[PDB]
């Protein structure tokens, strides 16, 4: 990656160099549909539904 932050002087003022991480951003979504029923089926217990 290289050094462009002058880490020695930064370390002298209490900023110690830590881990170097990659940069990952979401893209190219895969679309799938699904049905969600918000009301349950109570046919087998219809007598107590009221």
């Amino acid at each position, epitope marked *: 990656t290289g050094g462009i932050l002058h880490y020695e002087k930064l370390s002298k003022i209490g900023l110690v160099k830590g881990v170097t991480r990659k940069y990952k951003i979401k893209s190219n979504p895969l679309t799938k549909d699904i049905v969600i029923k918000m009301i349950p089926n*109570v046919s087998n217990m*219809s*007598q*107590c*539904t*009221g």
Partner: nanobody
Amino acid sequence: GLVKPGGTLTLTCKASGFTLSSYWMCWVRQAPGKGLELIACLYTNGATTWYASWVNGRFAISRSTSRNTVDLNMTSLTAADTATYFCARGSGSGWSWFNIWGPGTLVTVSS
């Protein structure tokens, strides 16, 4: 039992073995020598009602909610409306089979 074609009639449930408001309640009709036909149910809340496709507002259910009765109102009666009208309790608060059948009230349209 007596009624005139085009007249009106009001019936009442004669089950009287329980609190009527806590049970599912339909009105079942049966023409003489014909099959049983379901007319109209009434939910325990008392506002929501179920009706067969053929009634089309001709019949109406209500409950006295004080005398523990349930009524059925009829209008524009014809010869086909001659039947025995059964008040059937339905085992539970909600939709269900009937395990208690009322004695029924004979109804005769005729000049």
